[PDB]
């Protein structure tokens, strides 16, 4: 695919943990979503920074969810002023597993980066696996005759 390996820096992990903790201080939340900035080296992603964006969703309905894309653009500009070589390469969320509305959020993010990568970062200290699980959106062409849909193809993630 367009992505061969996603390298997530420890700064990204610490930023994600801090974002989750500061939002969860409110005492009523499930996951937090932010934007991932990095560079491109051959076909290996180099996710190196991140910033939190306002985000909310309904507990019952998956189609109801708000993401502040204007905030996304403004903080992208602010970070680009500091580091021009770090560009939007995808997004992240701290939900332990995927969500049904993750495809819609990736479609929203794809405008800023066409080959956006979603890195699910589990804040909970899993004993065996890496905290990061990288996915990229692909058009799955089924052979059963079912119409082509958008799915998340997994990508080998490294720290």
């Amino acid at each position: 695919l367009a992505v061969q390996k996603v390298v997530v820096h420890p700064l990204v992990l610490l930023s994600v943990v801090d974002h989750f903790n500061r939002i969860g201080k409110v005492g009523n939340q499930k996951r937090v979503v932010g934007v991932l900035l990095g560079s491109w080296q051959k076909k290996v992603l180099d996710v190196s920074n991140s910033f939190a964006v306002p985000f909310d969703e309904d507990d019952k309905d998956d189609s109801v969810w708000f993401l502040d894309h204007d905030y996304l653009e403004n903080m992208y500009g602010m970070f680009k002023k500091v580091n021009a070589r770090e560009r939007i390469v995808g997004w992240y969320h701290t939900g332990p597993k995927l969500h049904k509305n993750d495809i819609a959020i990736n479609e929203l993010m794809k405008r800023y980066c066409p080959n956006s990568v979603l890195v699910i970062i589990d804040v909970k200290p899993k004993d065996l696996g890496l905290p990061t699980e990288a996915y990229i959106s692909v058009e799955e062409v089924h052979d059963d005759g079912t119409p082509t849909s958008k799915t998340f193809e997994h990508v080998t993630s490294e720290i």
């Binding site: 089924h142 052979d143 059963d144 005759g145 079912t146 119409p147 082509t148 849909s149």
Partner: protein, 373 residues
């Protein structure tokens, strides 16, 4: 200009009340809400056959077409051109129709589908292929599936059926059945489509995944139909039972296409018999004697090698042939659809595998406990 509407208000081809409702919608300028009533009336249960609705185009919809949904503007013209039958001027009609609706790519897709179907009717397969290959590329750019996909898939399936390319016809018929709920289709249409899909799957080139086809709900429309033999034939293809195929010859030979391509059908079912033979045996005993393949596939021994060649060339199975010992060392099979009981057996194999992995992990942890970090 609305004089036609006022004419039909008193002396109308349809019900004057319907024309009054259309007049009220026009006066209120509920143009889109006028489009639903126009859709309801265009498929008229009274004068769909009469040519009067043709003048509905120029008199009524041509005046307000500048602010109609192109996708909702096109299918009205589909039934409008349904009435007219003159071939060549229909092409210009639909060309102008395609020209006016340029903002919506779906409208262009539907217009090209209509012109492709009409050109398939006249037998111009060469230009129909070019139109199909262009509208397919345009359809790929369209995100997701919409209401226009089904018409495209039907047109392309009919094109491949007219050519006779069974593989592509089966491929596209699967898509068509995938973008349309089967409950909406008539029972006769479902039965006919299931019969043709099974026929293409039998006659298609490289169509070996009969397990997925067998689970298609469309075939369920033929459970009690007289064409149930076809399902049985597919069963004979799924298990690679060439003896079942020869027994069912008395039923499937009556179909002209199966009778014509019985040789290719026999070759395909022989390949599937090879797949079944390698699949049944456990991985320790996947060395099939030449006699076993010859007896199972109802072929001579000296031909067995050639059969394996095909199965090796297509990619159905992997392995090698030891002709000196007259054996076939099969090492890999095309994965097939498994029953729930087979899945349970696979889960039991996973249980044993997990037990072994856990036992060895505990052994390594215990033996190297002092040096483990």
């Amino acid at each position: 200009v609305p004089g036609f509407l006022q004419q039909s208000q008193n002396s109308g081809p349809g019900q004057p009340a319907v024309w009054h409702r259309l007049e009220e919608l026009y006066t209120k300028k509920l143009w889109h809400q006028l489009t639903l009533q126009v859709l309801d009336f265009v498929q008229d249960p009274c004068f769909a056959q009469g040519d009067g609705l043709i003048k509905l185009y120029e008199n009524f919809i041509s005046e307000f077409e500048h602010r109609v949904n192109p996708l909702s503007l096109v299918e009205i013209i589909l039934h409008v051109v349904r009435q007219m039958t003159d071939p060549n001027v229909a092409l210009t009609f639909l060309e102008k129709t395609r020209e006016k609706v340029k903002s919506s790519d779906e409208a262009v897709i539907l217009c090209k589908t209509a012109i492709g179907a009409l050109k398939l009717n006249i037998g111009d397969l060469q230009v129909t292929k070019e139109t199909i290959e262009d509208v397919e590329e345009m359809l790929n750019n369209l995100p997701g599936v919409t209401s226009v996909h089904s018409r495209f898939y039907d047109l392309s399936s009919k094109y491949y059926q007219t050519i006779g390319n069974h593989a592509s016809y089966y491929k596209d018929a699967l898509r068509f059945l995938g973008c349309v709920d089967i409950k909406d289709l008539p029972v006769s249409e479902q039965q006919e489509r299931a019969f043709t899909l099974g026929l293409a799957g039998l006659l298609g080139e490289g169509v070996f995944n009969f397990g997925e086809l067998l689970m298609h709900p469309v075939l369920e429309s033929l459970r009690n139909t007289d064409r149930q033999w076809l399902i049985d034939t597919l069963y004979a293809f799924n298990s690679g039972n060439v003896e079942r195929f020869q027994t069912l010859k008395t039923a499937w030979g009556q179909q002209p296409d199966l009778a014509a391509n019985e040789a290719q059908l026999l070759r395909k079912i022989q390949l599937l018999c090879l797949m079944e033979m390698t699949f049944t045996r456990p991985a320790n005993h996947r060395q099939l004697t030449f006699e076993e393949i010859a007896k199972s596939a109802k072929i001579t021994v000296n031909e067995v090698e050639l059969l394996v060649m095909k199965a090796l060339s297509v990619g159905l199975v992997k392995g090698s042939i030891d002709e000196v010992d007259k054996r076939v060392h099969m090492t890999w099979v095309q994965p097939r659809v498994l029953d729930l009981q087979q899945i349970k057996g696979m889960k039991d194999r996973l249980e044993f595998w997990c037990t072994d992995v856990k036992s060895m992990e505990m052994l390594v942890e215990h033996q190297a406990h002092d040096i483990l970090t």
